[PDB]
Amino acid sequence: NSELNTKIVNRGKEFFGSISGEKPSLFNKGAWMGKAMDWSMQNEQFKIQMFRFVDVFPSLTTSKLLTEHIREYFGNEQDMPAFMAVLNKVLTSNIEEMARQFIVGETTKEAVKNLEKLRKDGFAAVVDVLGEATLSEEEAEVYTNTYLELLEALKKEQGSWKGLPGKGGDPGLDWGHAPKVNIAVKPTALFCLANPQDFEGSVVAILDRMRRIFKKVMELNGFLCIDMESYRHKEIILEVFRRLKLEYRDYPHLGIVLQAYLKDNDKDLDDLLAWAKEHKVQISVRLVKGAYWDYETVKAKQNDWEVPVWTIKAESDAAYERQARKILENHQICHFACASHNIRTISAVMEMARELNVPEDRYEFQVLYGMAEPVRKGILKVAGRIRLYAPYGNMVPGMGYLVRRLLENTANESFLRQSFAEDAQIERLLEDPAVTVERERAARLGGLPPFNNEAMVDFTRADHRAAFPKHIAQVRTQLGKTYPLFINGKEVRTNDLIPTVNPNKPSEVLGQICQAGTTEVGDAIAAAKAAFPAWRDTDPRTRAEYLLKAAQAARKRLFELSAWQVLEIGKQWDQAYADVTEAIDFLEYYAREMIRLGQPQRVGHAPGELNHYFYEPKGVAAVIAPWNFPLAISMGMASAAIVTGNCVVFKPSGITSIIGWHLVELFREAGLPEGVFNFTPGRGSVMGDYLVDHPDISLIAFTGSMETGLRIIERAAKVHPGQANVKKIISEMGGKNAIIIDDDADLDEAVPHVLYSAFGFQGQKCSACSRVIVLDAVYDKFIERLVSMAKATKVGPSEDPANYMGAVADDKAMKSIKEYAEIGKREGHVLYESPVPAGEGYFVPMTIIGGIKPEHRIAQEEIFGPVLAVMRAKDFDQAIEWANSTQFALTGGIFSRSPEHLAKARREFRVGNLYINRNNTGALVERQPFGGARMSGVGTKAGGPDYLLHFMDPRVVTENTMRRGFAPIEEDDDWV
Amino acid sequence: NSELNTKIVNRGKEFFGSISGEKPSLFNKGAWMGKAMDWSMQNEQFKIQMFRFVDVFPSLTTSKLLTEHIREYFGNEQDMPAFMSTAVLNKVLTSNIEEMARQFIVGETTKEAVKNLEKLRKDGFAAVVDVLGEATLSEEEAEVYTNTYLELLEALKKEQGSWKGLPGKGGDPGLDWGHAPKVNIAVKPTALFCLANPQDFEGSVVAILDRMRRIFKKVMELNGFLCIDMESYRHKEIILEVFRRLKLEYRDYPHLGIVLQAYLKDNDKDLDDLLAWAKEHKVQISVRLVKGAYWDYETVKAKQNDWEVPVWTIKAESDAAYERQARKILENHQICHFACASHNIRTISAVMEMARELNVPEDRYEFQVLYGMAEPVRKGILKVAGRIRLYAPYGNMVPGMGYLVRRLLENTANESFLRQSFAEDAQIERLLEDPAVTVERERGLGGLPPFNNEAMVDFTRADHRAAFPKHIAQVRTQLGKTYPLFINGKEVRTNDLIPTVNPNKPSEVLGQICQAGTTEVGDAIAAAKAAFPAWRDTDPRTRAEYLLKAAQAARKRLFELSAWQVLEIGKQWDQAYADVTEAIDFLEYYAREMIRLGQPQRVGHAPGELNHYFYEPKGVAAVIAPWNFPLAISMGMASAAIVTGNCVVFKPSGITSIIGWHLVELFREAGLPEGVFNFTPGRGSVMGDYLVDHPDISLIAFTGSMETGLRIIERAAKVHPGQANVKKIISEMGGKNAIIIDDDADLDEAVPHVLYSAFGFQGQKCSACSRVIVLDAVYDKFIERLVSMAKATKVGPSEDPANYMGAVADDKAMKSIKEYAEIGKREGHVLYESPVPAGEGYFVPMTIIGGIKPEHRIAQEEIFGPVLAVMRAKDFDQAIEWANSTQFALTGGIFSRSPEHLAKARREFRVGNLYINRNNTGALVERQPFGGARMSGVGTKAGGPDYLLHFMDPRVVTENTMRRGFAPIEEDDDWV
């Protein structure tokens, strides 16, 4: 109502007048910090450098690291802004001061002292131990015992504390009603593998530590608040809160954060309230807007997910007022902490509490330490119940927090910045955000929508979590079939059968595969050759349409197709779903690529002449596919050849033949003309060379081992009698991929990314990291954390989402990988070797081996398993040299925050796909066109804009258009 | 001059007034011709179809041919325009087309012509008689044309005595108007010599002069007038010289005329020179001043060769030019008799008033118009001046087609005075405006201009004609040198020397070439490998700059570099120059292509992430080059490898090793860093496999024979120890190229294009036509004309421009080609075999063999010499089948005017470069990217937008830009 609004605006106006002139420290341009923040708000390029420098700063531990990074981020001393070895001391001290702005101490004992001082100034606190996204069980224990230690200290002191002044009640309690000891805990700091993919396991592990903390909290009648973090963990955290609450249904001092910036929150808050009523318990909510807005937006768009946050700032403000109102309406069962620095927001809560006549012991106000000082003073004066969020700890564990503060204070849409950095437009600042919302909503090829990668599986969703076990079960009702060849549109059975089994459980037979002899392979090639002329003459637009149809067919079977892979080749849930989406991506991308390349282009501009340049297919393509990306790679190579006008004879890998059969199913459903796609699984020793040597073959697409690929290249180079063309070769032959960890690397990112690159899908990826090359100065520290996280992971059946990795492809892979592991143990020193499950299954321990140098076999030879080599580089030059020391050059990674070292790696770390500050696997179509040279391939990049040309050859038609001195004028003619 | 101008306008106004609205027959919408033209003028698509149909019509000699072409040009009966309605359709259309041919032609034969001329005299018109024909194909045809004039003159000789003189104001009563000879004929010089070409300036003049003289003696015998028509700019200087010489042999004889074309920029000077020349020699001349008949042709032809357009490009400029020059002629009436040849009323009025103002005697100027055109204008002249002469051509439709289509173009052009006056209802004041007034009123990327092909040699220029013999003599002062290897910026000499000689005169030794052993090759490879890292790291823009410098260096030495080729490998003057310009083109094009490809593309649009896609070189490239395009292909392959950042070891063909040395000279002058380019001529039998097999070679660019190409492909496929990359193969392996001569083909165009395709440079081109496939129905006539033109050509030293072709490359080639000729002579039957010069030289006769079928060797094997197979196809489908019957697919041609047959060819005649209605050689950079598949190559096209990528491999750098939940927003980002 406009009546409540008026009272709110008028209260905001009084809040501002009582604050007149007083600015927050961060906006005081008479101190270094205010000058630095000011220039960051005025110069975006400078903000980016300063903020990144702050992040890397605590890792700059030598005089060399500091001096060089300063110059790389701020340029020469004669070139920096005026407010910016002496240079080292000046910057260090200023940056250190900026860090302690937001912390009440580095240590527990320091924190307690400073906390006891804040009470004397009249301030309550909620204490947080700085830390998040823990990397190991041992780290989670340190975090847990720190709270235990903190609570012991506070227990011994709270008895001596006078309760903060109030309107009455218990003088031993704060304001007469609030427990004097109040702490906040970050759930992800309690379990290093927190992941909604393993929902139940994440909840339990976190719950068990939270319960241990909660028990100590309750002993001193304290308050525990459970912080909310990134959207990825919101449902996990809600469930932790509910279970703990029900375990102690009568204990009222337990709170949960709810983030008004989430679209989910209107429902989440309704649900929680209804839940509390249903169970006859009381709850407490700290309502916040949200701390991870940029991250959530970015992460959502990188995965083609719904962005979980509102995208207009005033919508979070409007949501907050809505939800606060709802909470206050429900004050009988829901205690309320208002957590905002926004004077409009605060004034709104205050008026709503008055309008709903809410008792004062049912709501309090909270702000972050070091921030919005006058706002905080205003709250203290006018309401009297102010609690400071007071975090403590060191700069590296606190970095995420600290950077979030600088973001928060300097964002364009920051209420604080708009109030205290720009000429404050008080009326605009205090307007009902709903009105603001409505006004800003007011302001805001070939018929095909442009390409977008298919949405990734999203385990924050209940239905996605439930989908896998259901579809795995459904696949199990359909095992035991005999799969035939598919030639010229017909099923062809043979006598030679090879069973395909579950690698995590070999006694489970999934089906039997007919093998084609050379007679059937010959038939398929002949079928292909016969279908060719009509296919080649089919319009590129029509050909692309079949791919589009096949993509819709696949999209509709996404979870079913994934489940088959989970069982047949031992893909983890995410790995399986990613394999199918990539297949879909290839279909959609190559469709568009053929449509683009399908139209003849006029070349040259001379008059009286028309030159058209255009492409044509080659003929019969042999597609020889690997087992490790059984749908994605197969479909990529086959659809590529098919859309470009060729016809395909396709040999799937034996152990993934059912996945190969999925191509048959999809192209069938798309109505593909007979003979255009043929499925001929067979024994390579029987029909391998035959397929490659055949004179009717014009193109060979292959992915697999270097040995095989190089043999194919050599044999295909011969022109046999009758062979119309020199055989085109598309080969991808794997790698020995390294990630370099520079001495300034962010280890909290580096460690889990390295672990995933190495052991995701048991390391069975051409792209997998099999070498981590670590700079001398961070070696011991990085290695300890890597091994520590590794020890937390579990090896077991891929159908169980609690397992990090599982059995390798087949027994041959197991025997060969184990031999490599033994060689590695003699060359270096084992750092970690995981347990494996007892009994059947092709299990190889997750294995990390140190002491490795370029001369070693496991530093050179592709193992294609869960064996990671760790190599100690003396400096960054050697790290680069070592990275380039194999005969492969497929992928590579580097964790570094030195612009110079990154610039050097971009130039000199010459792999087909180099990744900076993330894992070196998970290449997406269009975004990361995939493939390398040297012994890794012939420089063809799947999923990119040069790929389709490899399956075709260009032709030019030149026409003399002049007849008897008369030529037609064309639009783009050079004329006069 | 406003006073003169006012008389002119007023006189024009009376002229239009006296016309009384009458329209010339072609603009009479009452008749079919008027309707056809009116609709052609309103609908450009119809115009194109109608004009092309008229062109092909006289060759539709059977009912099916006719019926089919009608449907193909105009569609089914029910869809074509009303005036086209009524095989009956064949009869109606035939009838209308014949009538429109008779509009512009006074008859088909001499006798018919004579009778119709007398009828015109009776109506008051004089005549200048022309025998339809131009651009003759043989001596036999030139003789037929000459004898037709002689026959014509004998007939008029007997008749003229009976003719009463046309009425005049005074003079001799036995002469027309009292002063003009009754017999006036016009002759086209290019109808008198089939090889008329300023490249053979003197030989062309003499041949034409010799026939012109015989005609002229007969003309003088009856006291007649002879006018020499002017044709395309290519022959203008030749025709002028022919006139000068004839005039001087008969300085007494006043009745010899010459056409000058006011649409030429040269014409002001040409008229001035001719006038002065006449004064210096004390002789009188006669000039028929015209604007010009070949405007579109000249514009197109100049643009296609990057020549200066010889014509004004604003129509009013030709008009203003005409008035200037006319005035100058009238002022010089003492020595220059004037024929005003124009249908433009403004022009005519200008001449008339200018002649009255200068009081020119009426016996010094007369008016002329084309028969069948501008009827009311023609009658207007008769009434006002009395002295009007019709240009009256005669002959058949095929010989008359050029003339006829010129008339259609002339009456229908947007800029046509007749169209504006009689179709477009233009304002008279505007039509009569001083054209000088009209003239006044009507008047790249990376800092680099867009690519343009280098200007071709232009032998209409006297300095160009004179340049060749002088540079050849200069080259002869440079003979006898020893050419060393060039390695790492140093000259390396070996003691194994091979002489290179003049193939047209083997006793002339051009120099001695050092041969590289395997030792020096290895040194070259090692030097390239060592220069590679710094070259690879050189800015692509900087790399391109070296190519541009090399281009500039070559452009300065164009004639010199050309002369070397004339002597060393026996290129003809134009062939040599075109080789050098093509080298320059590769340099300019590939520079620009590298600048385009050298900038990294952001790929994908996900935020928090940057993917950059870019290209890197491979390493050391072996360039193995042919002798047949010794600068062009060499510079092509090498500069491509170089600009993309590879280093080159270059093996020129032994017999063109000096041309190879030009690359050393050009790259030296460009300042290319040492080791980037190395020159190692050597014995294939010594260092061939060694260069190809070397572990440090990453790429091999080869152009030459299939046998060697396939050998290289096979050997390169093996990966030796130490070999970093799978060898990239770029191979161009020749062709067995056919041209199809369809039964509706324009034979006047086909014959000389086939001859040139087969015998240009002795047939030593991969692109050369070695098979001409001719439809049953035109075979005998095509062959007669082809053999007749061949017989006209002379075989001899390429330094003498009079020769069509000369000796082949070397002794081995001479013997091998001759064996093939003998093979062909036993498979088929010899149709033509030229004389060759006596004595020294590697001469092989220009040879044509008929009776050839697909199963014959010389229908399959590439001969690479002046041996043409003639094949007789039963129908179009067999022609296509036969065209596709070899293992090669490089180039191809088709002469046809059937939309369906062309479409079938575009689809089914699957060669790398297909040419419609022109020769299949002389592909230009950009306009015709050159190369094919099958046994002709591996689908790489030099001079095209896909070429550079073959010398590189793609790389992607993917960067996670988010730090601590903060990422910079980019422009191309998908956001909110």
Ligand SMILES: Cc1cc2nc3c(=O)[nH]c(=O)nc-3n(C[C@H](O)[C@H](O)[C@H](O)COP(=O)(O)OP(=O)(O)OC[C@H]3O[C@@H](n4cnc5c(N)ncnc54)[C@H](O)[C@@H]3O)c2cc1C
């Ligand atoms: C004591 C306390 C505890 C907190 N605990 C947590 C926690 O456990 N988890 C958590 O996630 N947050 C938490 N927060 C909130 C977060 O740390 C910020 O302090 C808060 O979001 C800023 O809101 P505001 O009213 O102070 O400032 P404002 O300037 O009013 O609000 C800024 C907020 O708007 C939102 N926003 C910014 N841009 C947009 C946009 N384009 N579209 C939509 N919304 C936008 C963001 O949430 C941003 O934080 C807590 C805050 C306090 C004071």
